[PDB]
Design a protein around this ligand. Structure first.
Ligand code: F3S
Ligand code: CO
Length: 66
């Protein structure tokens, strides 16, 4: 279980995330990333989403674990 989130104020619509890792991060009505999933449990999906996080220029991707 890894829930993903994206601070809506930090984000600039740079869009490395939607590339890179597309099953996970999708560009909303106002050009700010959002996730397509409320939970990730596949690890290869996770990998791509952590990749995204390590990459986002303004770093507004936060992944989370329970
Ligand atoms: S800028 Fe926002 S659009 Fe994605 S790559 Fe960073 S979270
Ligand atoms: Co389960």
């Amino acid at each position: 279980a890894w829930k993903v989130s994206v601070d809506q104020d930090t984000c600039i619509g740079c869009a490395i995330c939607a590339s890179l890792c597309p099953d996970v991060f999708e560009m909303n009505d106002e050009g700010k990333a959002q996730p397509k999933v409320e939970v990730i449990e596949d690890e290869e999906l996770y990998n791509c989403a952590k990749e995204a996080m390590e990459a986002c220029p303004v770093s507004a991707i936060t992944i989370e674990e329970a």
